[PDB]
Design an enzyme around this catalytic site. Sequence first.
Site, PDB file in Angstrom:
ATOM      1  N   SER A   4       0.848  -1.183   0.000  1.00  0.00           N
ATOM      2  CA  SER A   4       0.000   0.000   0.000  1.00  0.00           C
ATOM      3  C   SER A   4       0.891   1.242   0.000  1.00  0.00           C
ATOM      4  CB  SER A   4      -0.885  -0.006   1.249  1.00  0.00           C
ATOM      5  OG  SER A   4      -1.766   1.104   1.250  1.00  0.00           O
ATOM      6  N   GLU A  27      -3.582   6.586  -2.795  1.00  0.00           N
ATOM      7  CA  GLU A  27      -3.036   5.242  -2.764  1.00  0.00           C
ATOM      8  C   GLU A  27      -2.803   4.540  -4.092  1.00  0.00           C
ATOM      9  OE1 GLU A  27      -4.839   2.643   0.046  1.00  0.00           O
ATOM     10  OE2 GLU A  27      -3.552   0.940  -0.473  1.00  0.00           O
TER      11      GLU A  27
HETATM   12  N1  LIG Z   1       1.588   2.771   4.264  1.00  0.00           N
HETATM   13  C1  LIG Z   1       1.261   3.686   3.344  1.00  0.00           C
HETATM   14  O1  LIG Z   1       2.117   4.421   2.796  1.00  0.00           O
HETATM   15  C2  LIG Z   1      -0.184   3.880   2.953  1.00  0.00           C
HETATM   16  C3  LIG Z   1      -0.458   4.503   1.591  1.00  0.00           C
HETATM   17  C4  LIG Z   1      -1.800   4.056   1.094  1.00  0.00           C
HETATM   18  C5  LIG Z   1      -2.854   3.989   2.048  1.00  0.00           C
HETATM   19  N2  LIG Z   1      -2.599   3.730   3.460  1.00  0.00           N
HETATM   20  C6  LIG Z   1      -3.583   2.759   4.113  1.00  0.00           C
HETATM   21  O2  LIG Z   1      -2.999   2.257   5.333  1.00  0.00           O
HETATM   22  C7  LIG Z   1      -3.638   0.961   5.721  1.00  0.00           C
HETATM   23  C8  LIG Z   1      -2.596   0.005   6.176  1.00  0.00           C
HETATM   24  O3  LIG Z   1      -1.333   0.374   5.570  1.00  0.00           O
HETATM   25  P1  LIG Z   1       0.067  -0.014   6.248  1.00  0.00           P
HETATM   26  O4  LIG Z   1       1.132   0.510   5.390  1.00  0.00           O
HETATM   27  O5  LIG Z   1       0.136   0.235   7.718  1.00  0.00           O
HETATM   28  O6  LIG Z   1       0.016  -1.625   6.061  1.00  0.00           O
HETATM   29  P2  LIG Z   1       1.139  -2.717   6.251  1.00  0.00           P
HETATM   30  O7  LIG Z   1       0.563  -4.026   5.838  1.00  0.00           O
HETATM   31  O8  LIG Z   1       2.380  -2.246   5.607  1.00  0.00           O
HETATM   32  O9  LIG Z   1       1.361  -2.706   7.833  1.00  0.00           O
HETATM   33  C9  LIG Z   1       2.460  -3.437   8.400  1.00  0.00           C
HETATM   34  C10 LIG Z   1       3.094  -2.596   9.476  1.00  0.00           C
HETATM   35  O10 LIG Z   1       4.242  -3.422   9.881  1.00  0.00           O
HETATM   36  C11 LIG Z   1       5.428  -2.835   9.331  1.00  0.00           C
HETATM   37  N3  LIG Z   1       5.763  -3.595   8.114  1.00  0.00           N
HETATM   38  C12 LIG Z   1       5.398  -3.484   6.764  1.00  0.00           C
HETATM   39  N4  LIG Z   1       5.944  -4.388   5.987  1.00  0.00           N
HETATM   40  C13 LIG Z   1       6.717  -5.150   6.759  1.00  0.00           C
HETATM   41  C14 LIG Z   1       7.568  -6.309   6.476  1.00  0.00           C
HETATM   42  N5  LIG Z   1       7.709  -6.802   5.264  1.00  0.00           N
HETATM   43  N6  LIG Z   1       8.221  -6.828   7.586  1.00  0.00           N
HETATM   44  C15 LIG Z   1       8.119  -6.367   8.848  1.00  0.00           C
HETATM   45  N7  LIG Z   1       7.314  -5.267   9.172  1.00  0.00           N
HETATM   46  C16 LIG Z   1       6.631  -4.686   8.098  1.00  0.00           C
HETATM   47  C17 LIG Z   1       5.173  -1.329   9.016  1.00  0.00           C
HETATM   48  O11 LIG Z   1       5.877  -0.434   9.790  1.00  0.00           O
HETATM   49  C18 LIG Z   1       3.665  -1.237   8.974  1.00  0.00           C
HETATM   50  O12 LIG Z   1       3.148  -0.190   9.843  1.00  0.00           O
HETATM   51  C19 LIG Z   1      -4.439   0.510   4.444  1.00  0.00           C
HETATM   52  O13 LIG Z   1      -5.861   0.681   4.659  1.00  0.00           O
HETATM   53  C20 LIG Z   1      -3.953   1.445   3.319  1.00  0.00           C
HETATM   54  O14 LIG Z   1      -4.950   1.616   2.341  1.00  0.00           O
HETATM   55  C21 LIG Z   1      -1.192   3.533   3.778  1.00  0.00           C
END
Ligand SMILES: NC(=O)c1ccc[n+]([C@@H]2O[C@H](COP(=O)([O-])OP(=O)(O)OC[C@H]3O[C@@H](n4cnc5c(N)ncnc54)[C@H](O)[C@@H]3O)[C@@H](O)[C@H]2O)c1
Length: 212
Positions: free
Chosen positions: A138, A180
């Site tokens: 995302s 997004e």
């Molecule tokens: N993250 C963004 O930049 C972003 C941009 C679009 C919309 N939003 C919205 O945010 C919501 C959730 O997004 P998100 O980015 O928190 O989801 P995510 O699935 O990335 O959340 C995982 C969390 O764990 C950590 N993480 C991510 N990938 C990892 C990996 N491979 N290994 C270990 N830790 C990891 C991150 O710090 C993150 O906060 C969704 O509804 C999405 O539409 C977020």
Amino acid sequence: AETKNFTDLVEATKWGNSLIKSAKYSSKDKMAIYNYTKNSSPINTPLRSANGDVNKLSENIQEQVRQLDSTISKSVTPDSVYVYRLLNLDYLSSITGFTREDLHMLQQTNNGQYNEALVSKLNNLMNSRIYRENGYSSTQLVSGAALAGRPIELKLELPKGTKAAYIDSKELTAYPGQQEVLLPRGTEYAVGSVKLSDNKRKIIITAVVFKK
Ligand SMILES: NC(=O)c1ccc[n+]([C@@H]2O[C@H](COP(=O)([O-])OP(=O)(O)OC[C@H]3O[C@@H](n4cnc5c(N)ncnc54)[C@H](O)[C@@H]3O)[C@@H](O)[C@H]2O)c1
């Protein structure tokens, strides 16, 4: 034409809408995207728990994954472009060589600014390495359009023609305004560098995504 990097929301929306139009989403596509943005844990957690192996997932989840994979592949980037994945420090627990203590110290900022020495270590530990996100990725076309308070900014350069879904439209996302761009599950990216932002209040991980 050269790589795009959006700072203006209107220009981003215009560019994104073109992907949406080329996608020609059906009601099934809209449902998959929306439900994911609203409640994605049921899908990405199990995916992450078993690498990108969809075959280890329950039947309901495999169907939803195949569906979303298909929806995302319905559109590709018309230009090379940067998208931003804002992350928390927990992300770094997945990096080999960065100790529990490095993170402990890393969280201890100086008025928000991060330790340059530990960031340099990250650079050393991550440079020229290919990482893979097992869940879907995302991201945002405009950095800061969402969760702008997060510590890490994964700056990803997307090659022209790679699969990606722009979903910032009221019928596609439960959270409009985040510009997004949803990337395929299993997205691979080679880290170019890890540096402090211009204001040293964020850690920027710049990488290039492999065309998918
Ligand atoms: N993250 C963004 O930049 C972003 C941009 C679009 C919309 N939003 C919205 O945010 C919501 C959730 O997004 P998100 O980015 O928190 O989801 P995510 O699935 O990335 O959340 C995982 C969390 O764990 C950590 N993480 C991510 N990938 C990892 C990996 N491979 N290994 C270990 N830790 C990891 C991150 O710090 C993150 O906060 C969704 O509804 C999405 O539409 C977020």
